[PDB]
From a paper:
Here, we show a unique type of Cu/Zn-SOD from Deinococcus radiodurans (DrSOD) with an additional β-propeller domain. In this study, we revealed a unique structure of DrSOD, where the Cu/Zn-SOD domain (DrSODSOD) is fused with a six-bladed β-propeller domain (DrSODβ-pro).
Under these conditions, crystallization occurred at a relatively acidic pH (pH 4.0), which likely hindered the zinc binding (top). These observations thus suggest that Asp339 plays a role in the binding of the calcium ion.
Residue numbers in the entry: 25 to 80, 89 to 100, 122 to 160, 172 to 462
Amino acid sequence: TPLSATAALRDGAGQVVGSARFVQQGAGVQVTVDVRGLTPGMHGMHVHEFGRCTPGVPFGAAGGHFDPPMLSVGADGVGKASFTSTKISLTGENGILNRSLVIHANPGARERCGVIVRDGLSVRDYALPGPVDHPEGVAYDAKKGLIYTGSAQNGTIYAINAQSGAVTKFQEGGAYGRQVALGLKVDPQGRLWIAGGAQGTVSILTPDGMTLAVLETPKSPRPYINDLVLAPDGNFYVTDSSRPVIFRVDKALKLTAWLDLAGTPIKYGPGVNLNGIAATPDGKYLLAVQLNTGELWRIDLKTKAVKKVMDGLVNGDGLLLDGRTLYVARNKDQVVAKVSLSADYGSGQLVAQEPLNGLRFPATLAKVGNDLVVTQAQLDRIGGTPETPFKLTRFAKF
Ligand SMILES: [Cu+2]
């Protein structure tokens, strides 16, 4: 099934007066435009940054021209175009899904606008209320029907009712160990486990929203506790994307350095190293992705032996293991990758990469009922100018 998108082109009164169709063909996008009611001659036609066609001037809410192709309308006011472009894409870091197509007046004012909507793939966005939320980790409590997601900027955990979308503050951030929230997991007791980023902490909250414990790691320079996972053996394993160590938290809540990575094939370098982590359901292995190198690693829980599984996942962030299928959020690339794993988890093949309906720095993944949810963290905009509202996006497995 090809990657394609459609934009229903509206005029200022909100009437749909045309359509633009986009079909990905390798590196190029085939574009077809049909629109009526325009003045004869050549018209500027550009992608703008936001997928909104409401006033901001008419169509001002579309924002500026998207930069990281002229429409000719005959005497009857009908504009017709058909070309292939290598300057746009429906996927990757510069993909145009959920942006807008705007037609201008001169070869000028904005005369037509349409939101570019992915064909054949339904999604549900859950908007968050704050100006700097930067939701990073996500987890789901199926018994309560609540999605939890945490702010990488200030540590607040929001609870989202998965059916209604209603957002509440599960626990405000700011306390010791609670100033940053990255990877999240819900354990069988309904407790929320929270990776603490540069605080070097792992925090645990009970389902009432109260803190149970803040666990510290050793004080050494540049801690960055990134993500964690509960293995079948009952232990949590915790990645640090800056310090070459994997931590373990046992059932009694004792945190230890479990594997020193120096001298293993995992070589830490500049940037984000191990971050997403998963546990195989047979209890034999951890899988962890190294973002900066793009390498996926298998770690034997009994011997601590390390094996490379595959390469090609640069910018790989959160992991979600579903049998022999591994989903990998690739944050800069704005896609969710799908990996098929061998039976001993010793090799893998990258089989698909989904841009969904447009993603802004997707960071982590969780299962919600029969679906998946991904955070649009926009972490590349932290301290800068993110698009608001921040959102989580729920979508079918693939
Ligand atoms: Cu423009």
